[PDB]
């Protein structure tokens, strides 16, 4: 069960917010502050493993993040989910932006947002691990460009 | 980030530079990626030479061997046409800890030192400072290098050519005795904190090569005397420590004007200030007698500052003044600020020290504050006047009563010791009450403070050795509680307590003295401000701040008997 | 969308007047007749929810461009309604009819957006009112589909339980879906079924056996796997059953995450059957290979999670465990603090009699390139732990015990001061063979007392001193200088120490005064006996002048006393044995 | 004289760090934090701080700490004025004195610093 996905830079400044627990925007918004002031005060050789703040629920749940470049991408699970499972799930996601987006960088989370939503959707599907078989995700958000283009 | 530098876009270059530099700044390890960095450190960008330079000053300690492979680039460097890679160069060069780039260092300094521009000349300085912590055996060139150093007209090289003589060759007086003159005159032109460096260094040249006041003695002094009025606190300050170090005692109070003035500055600034006025006005005070309302405390400054601005005002407490002090010192005494409200009651009794005609006067302050509802004001409030019963020996009925009814609502541990022992040594006075004082300790012995607990088997000899006919039971009550406790100082008294006391059975010539030696007169305490440890340390320095010499701390020396040669000197 | 971004970006200090602007600007544009201009609106409001601006003030236009023919209006729509409608959004009602008409589609991809937009609908009015249609897409004919339709299902069994009864066999027998994508799909959901209420599918267990022998998808082994080991408490039967196809895979891994699920998984499994079965001990060793290749690897995670996994089994095995040694000892230097922290509690734990030296040692010279205060003091408080664990068992040499204690005193600036001082007076006095050293140490400590008294902080080096002094007047017999060390004892430097580190020290250099007057009296030496006094009696004033309680009383009435056994000595009183009983 | 900066945040993390020399560790930090668990507030932590083989000179004020290391022995005022001065230009270069625009101009700070202090002796 993941609680919600947080995606921002080094600085903090939002990138991305779906959230799988019913929050007021200003609860997301200091949690998003909080979740980046817990990890990038870490340097790049630290684990990749946090402790849950309070504001997500409690302790319960850990916060699981990757760093690329000067992106983090969050991951807020319980302890009922897998620390590796959720990073290669990170991984294959990433990679997934990456040849969705021809070399993804930070400008296309800023610009293209909706479509980093559906990507996470297409991988992701209210807090269920939808699909991880990569070639298949990235073809089946290709045919949506499809009938975008079609239509 | 690798590939983004070995790319040949300058531009590219620049940002992977900057988003180093800014990963530097947090904090994190850059060391991995010097290689791509020493490749472009010749680069034709003066931007991305800058940014590259800092991060070889960053990271040449970490990553020592590959600047070592690569040493012929900063040989190269070292005669790039624009002064701040001169200087940067020469700064990665000092920055090599490895025993064997000597040499090289050595002859990067002599030719840094001879050359025109004063930006690298001061920073050859700063590289004299680095090979001097890294090889000092190479001393004696070293000083040759300042000594040529020194002789420089220009004030920029001036400030740090004189540190660097300093931390190098304290010793060697010689070379700045040669150039007072120059010294002084600059120091009028020196930037401020060249003008702070070379007022220390030329009041230890003082204080050693002068006798009480010779022209050159007043020659500081005449052009020392315009920076008194300077904005840069550290620069009066060290104006200020040079008259109370140098100038005779009938011009150097003339420093209090501007010493105060610097209160109005920040919270930092005054620190200091208060902490130095402390100990000056312990030696001298009248000078600093006028302005003892400036000295008031305000509520708006923190409990350091406030706290210091007390000290100030004992030490210039006197019987024309004390009076309005002790009046003053009743209103800090009830502020909301429980930190500085206990410094007060530590004020009071202090000033009533200082002035014995106030003693009881001191008392009503204090004794009627015993019945404040606040549990700290109490607790020192009774420290205080045990320090001003101790004093004076007299059977001030009219105090103690109070305090032992008292007792039985006193948690903190100091404030219950002194209790305590104010019903120890006033056992006879106190006959009635002082029985039922150790009754009421003995059975919350095992709850009491470790501190505390000392004080009830002192309590418990003190009373059996006059009242035995009915507390000797409670004496031994109490030391064979103490007998057992975990602290093995109470071990180590009851042991001690109980041999005096108890066995009769080996009653020596020691034993029938037992009731002398506990019940002694105690002489009254040589309270000392805690200011007077710094009449051993020179004012505006670190070590008069931590009252510790400090490393590297400059002693001064004391006036000497006869003045060394001045023909000498010019 | 992006020339909302571009405005915001421009706006940096002003993003709040220029969102107030675009915030009118979307109430203007929302209520226009066109859909895309709503969907636009749509677009930026949904930046504005990432931002953090309230998205249920137009939950209205959300769903009027939800209602949009077009696909392409339709998904921006449903994912502003998925981001949009709470538990407390009655408003949300507006949206059943395009949710029925989206639902019952038989477009794949258009019912895709629609389960998109549902997965953030999950309320028990919805659920109730949606539960049997999306029974009914259970098993549609399309693959797709059916994949996010059974996590539909997920959500409506966590609010709606009454379709959760009959709809469990229909999951049971979804379990065998062709598809790969939709069997993965039903996998997770019934896990995250099973993780709730893990006796009801006990007897579901053979299904998941066929499941993993069929299974190639890593990520559906993983959470498998996982289930697996939570059902152990419950049936260790089943983790009996299947901890060779456990080994299996363990063999066949090529996953690094993967192949630590499944040793920490099979941890948990030989950990419940060891109730009763003790002839597992080849699994376990093959698991703690497993978890040395884990560790060794480079990468921080793996290594952190691989070394919490050898601390459960240090924690089931240890045998096995204590082999490693040299591993954690080099894992010991990683950057993180917290793998550092696990490295130390392995260290406690695998400490023994015949390895404490060695990895004291090793602990001891990274505390000498420690830094930190709060790592400092952890590492010293572990050093204690680990060489004091059950009253000093594994320590033979207690000569480098009071050796490493000495060395612990370099750290200064420590906070567990009092700590070191307890354990030097505890080995003092426990052991008697070591009090020669202990004394000769401490009084070598005390003779640089002038360079100790730099750190008089309250738990800091002063309590140090006061365990010094304390075992040096004590067991004053074994001294080899007590006049010198006395004399150091009431150096002035002295006089700069918190109370009680005074009071003792007083107190115990009337104790060495004893020991020294008994060996001068002893002797006949009355001239150096009348020396000592006399020092004495020029050095205690200093002391009796102090403001602190404790030390001037004990320093007037000890003074007090030596005049007097100088009054006696000026009489030729053997003195010597009395003031020694007092401290006998 | 002045050795290495540590600008520290409210919430008591290292906001900026900085080395002219030698470089030493962020664990100098942790008695001025140890300090600021002893002190009632921002206003209570003394100027200068010991530590066992450095010197802690730090000044506060904008809401933020200007942390600088010392290790010989120097003149204390000597410190604190130059960190309220290299203060007072970060205020006159951004405009305010601020946690974010140091946080944005990070090389405007750092070139700040090195045009300030050169290898321990301030000067401009």
Not at chain 2, 270 to 290: C, D, H, W
Not at chain 3, 374 to 385: N, S, W
Request: charged share 25%; proline share 4%.
């Amino acid at each position: 069960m993941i609680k919600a996905i947080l995606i921002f830079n080094n600085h903090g400044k939002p990138r991305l917010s779906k959230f799988y627990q019913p929050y007021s925007e200003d609860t997301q918004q200091q949690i998003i502050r909080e979740t980046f002031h817990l990890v990038s005060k870490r340097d790049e050789n630290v684990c990749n493993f946090l402790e849950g703040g309070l504001l997500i629920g409690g302790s319960d749940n850990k916060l699981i993040y990757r760093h690329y470049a000067t992106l983090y991408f969050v991951f807020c699970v319980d302890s009922s989910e897998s620390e590796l499972g959720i990073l290669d799930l990170i991984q294959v996601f990433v990679e997934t932006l990456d040849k969705c987006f021809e070399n993804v960088c930070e400008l296309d989370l800023i610009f293209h947002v909706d479509k980093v939503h559906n990507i996470l959707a297409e991988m992701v599907m209210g807090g269920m691990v939808l699909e991880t078989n990569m070639n298949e995700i990235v073809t089946q958000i290709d045919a949506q460009n499809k009938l975008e283009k079609s239509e | 980030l690798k590939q983004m530098l070995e790319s040949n876009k300058d531009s590219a270059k620049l940002d992977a530079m900057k988003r180093i530099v800014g990963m530097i700044a947090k904090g994190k390890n850059a060391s991995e990626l010097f290689p791509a960095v020493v490749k472009n450190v010749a680069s034709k960008n003066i931007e991305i030479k800058k940014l590259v330079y800092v991060y070889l000053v960053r990271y040449a300690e970490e990553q020592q061997d590959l600047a070592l492979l690569s040493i012929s680039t900063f040989q190269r460097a070292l005669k790039d046409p624009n002064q701040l890679i001169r200087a940067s160069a020469l700064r990665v060069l000092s920055s090599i800890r490895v025993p064997i780039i000597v040499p090289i260092m050595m002859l990067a300094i002599k030719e840094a030192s001879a050359d025109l521009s004063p930006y690298v000349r001061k920073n050859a300085a700063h590289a004299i400072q680095k090979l001097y912590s890294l090889d000092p055996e190479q001393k004696e060139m070293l000083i040759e290098v300042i000594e040529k150093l020194l002789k420089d007209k220009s004030t920029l090289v001036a400030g740090s050519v004189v540190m660097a003589f300093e931390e190098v060759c304290p010793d060697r007086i010689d070379l700045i005795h040669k150039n007072y003159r120059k010294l002084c005159n600059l120091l009028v032109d020196v930037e401020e904190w060249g003008q702070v460096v070379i007022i220390h260094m030329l009041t230890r040249y003082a204080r050693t090569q002068f006798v009480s006041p010779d022209p050159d003695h007043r020659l500081l002094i005449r052009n020392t005397k315009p920076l008194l009025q300077s904005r840069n606190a550290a620069v009066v300050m060290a104006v200020a420590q040079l008259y109370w170090h140098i100038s005779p005692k009938s011009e150097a109070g003339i420093i209090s004007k501007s010493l105060v003035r610097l209160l109005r500055s920040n919270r930092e600034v005054q620190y200091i200030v208060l902490q130095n006025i402390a100990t000056m006005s312990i030696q001298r005070k009248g000078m600093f007698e006028p302005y003892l309302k400036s000295f008031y405390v305000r509520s708006t400054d923190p409990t350091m500052i406030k706290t210091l601005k007390l000290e100030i005002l004992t030490n210039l407490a006197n019987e024309a003044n004390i009076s309005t002090l002790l009046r003053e010192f009743q209103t800090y005494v009830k502020s909301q600020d429980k930190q500085f409200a206990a410094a007060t009651i530590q004020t009071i009794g202090r000033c009533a020290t200082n002035i014995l005609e106030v003693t009881d006067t001191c008392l009503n302050g204090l004794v009627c504050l015993l019945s404040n509802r606040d549990e700290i004001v109490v607790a020192e409030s009774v420290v205080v006047i045990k320090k001003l019963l101790q004093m004076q020996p007299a059977q001030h009925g009219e105090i103690i009563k109070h305090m032992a009814k008292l007792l039985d609502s006193i948690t903190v541990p100091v404030a219950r010791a002194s209790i305590l022992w104010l019903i120890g040594e006033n056992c006879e006075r106190v006959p009635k009450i002082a029985p039922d004082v150790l009754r009421k300790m003995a059975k919350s012995f095992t709850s009491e403070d470790d501190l505390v607990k000392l004080q009830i088997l002192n309590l418990g000899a003190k009373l059996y050795l006059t009242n035995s006919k009915q507390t000797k039971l409670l004496t031994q009550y109490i030391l064979n509680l103490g007998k057992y406790d975990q602290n093995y100082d109470i071990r180590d008294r009851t042991r001690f307590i109980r041999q005096l006391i108890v066995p009769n059975v080996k009653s020596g010539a020691l034993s029938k003295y037992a009731k002398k030696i506990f019940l002694a007169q105690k002489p009254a305490p040589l309270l000392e401000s805690p200011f007077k440890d710094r009449d051993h340390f020179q004012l505006g320095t670190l070590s008069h701040t931590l009252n510790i010499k400090a490393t590297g701390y400059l002693e001064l020396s004391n006036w000497p008997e006869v003045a060394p040669d001045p023909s000498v000197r010019n | 969308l992006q020339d909302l971004v571009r405005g915001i970006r421009n706006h940096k200090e002003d993003e709040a007047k220029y969102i107030s602007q675009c915030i009118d600007e979307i109430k203007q544009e929302l209520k226009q007749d066109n859909i895309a201009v709503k969907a636009n609106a749509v677009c930026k409001l949904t930046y504005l929810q990432m931002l953090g601006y309230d998205i249920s003030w137009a939950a209205f236009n959300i769903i009027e461009v939800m209602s949009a023919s077009k696909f392409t209006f339709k998904r921006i729509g449903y994912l502003a309604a998925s981001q949009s409608f709470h538990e407390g959004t009655d408003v949300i009602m507006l949206t059943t009819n395009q949710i029925r008409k989206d639902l019952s589609s038989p477009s794949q991809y258009d019912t895709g957006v629609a389960l998109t937009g549902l997965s953030c609908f999950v309320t028990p009015d919805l659920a109730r009112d949606l539960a049997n249609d999306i029974m009914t897409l259970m098993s549609h004919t399309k693959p797709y589909i059916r994949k996010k339709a059974v996590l539909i299902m997920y959500k409506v069994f966590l609010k709606y339980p009454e379709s959760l009864r009959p709809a469990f066999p229909r999951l049971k027998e979804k379990l065998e879906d062709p598809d790969p994508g939709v069997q993965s799909a039903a996998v997770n959901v019934i896990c995250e079924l099973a993780r709730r209420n893990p006796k009801n599918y006990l007897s579901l267990a053979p299904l998941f056996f066929k499941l993993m022998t069929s299974s190639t998808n890593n990520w559906v082994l993983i959470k498998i796997i996982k289930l697996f080991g939570a059902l152990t408490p419950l049936e260790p039967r089943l983790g009996k059953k299947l901890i060779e196809p456990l080994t299996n895979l363990i063999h066949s891994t090529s996953a690094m995450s993967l192949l630590y699920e499944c040793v920490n998984t099979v941890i948990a499994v030989l950990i419940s059957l060891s109730s009763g079965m003790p002839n597992h001990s080849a699994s376990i060793q093959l698991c703690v290979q497993k978890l040395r290749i884990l560790i060794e690897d480079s990468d921080q995670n793996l290594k952190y999670l691989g070394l919490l996994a050898m601390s459960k089994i240090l924690k089931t095995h240890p045998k096995s465990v204590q082999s490693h040694k040299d591993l954690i000892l080099q894992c010991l230097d990683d950057k993180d603090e917290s793998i550092r922290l696990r490295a130390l509690d392995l260290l406690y734990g695998m400490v023994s009699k015949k390895n404490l030296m060695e990895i004291v040692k090793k602990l001891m010279t990274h505390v000498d390139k420690a830094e930190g205060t709060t790592y400092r003091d952890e590492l010293l408080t572990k050093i204690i732990d680990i060489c004091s664990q059950s009253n000093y068992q594994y320590i033979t040499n207690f000569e480098w015990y009071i050796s490493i204690l000495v060395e612990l005193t370099r750290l200064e600036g420590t906070r567990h001061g009092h700590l070191i001082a307890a354990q030097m007076l505890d080995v003092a006095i426990r052991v008697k063979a070591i009090r020669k050293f202990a004394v000769s140490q401490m009084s070598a400590l005390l003779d640089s007392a002038h360079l100790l008294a730099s750190s008089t902080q309250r738990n800091g080096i002063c309590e140090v001193l006061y365990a010094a002094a304390w075992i040096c007047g004590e067991f004053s017999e074994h001294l080899q200088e007590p006049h010198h060390t006395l004399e150091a004892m009431l150096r002035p430097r002295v006089t700069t120490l918190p109370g009680h580190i005074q009071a003792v020290y007083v107190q115990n250099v009337v104790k060495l005064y004893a020991s020294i007057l008994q060996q001068k009296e002893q002797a006949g030496e009355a001239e150096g006996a009348q020396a000592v006094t006399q020092l004495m009696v020029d050095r205690l004033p200093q002391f009796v002048q102090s403001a602190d309680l404790e030390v001037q009383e004990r320093a007037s009435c000890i003074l007090q006393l030596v005049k007097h056994i100088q009054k006696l000595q000026a009489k030729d009183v053997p003195v010597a044995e009395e003031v020694s009983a007092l401290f006998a | 004289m002045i050795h290495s900066l540590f600008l520290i945040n409210c919430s008591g993390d290292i906001f900026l760090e900085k080395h002219w020399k030698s470089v030493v560790s962020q664990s100098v930090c942790d008695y001025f934090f140890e300090a600021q668990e002893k002190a009632a507030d921002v206003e209570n932590v003394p100027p200068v701080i010991s530590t066992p083989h450095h010197y802690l000179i730090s000044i506060y004020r904008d809401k933020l700490f200007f942390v600088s290391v010392i290790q010989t022995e120097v003149p204390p005022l000597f410190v604190i004025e130059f960190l309220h001065r290299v203060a007072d230009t970060f205020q006159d270069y951004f405009g305010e004195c601020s946690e974010a625009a140091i946080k944005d101009n990070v090389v405007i700070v750092y070139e700040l610093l090195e045009e300030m202090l050169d290898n321990g002796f301030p000067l401009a």
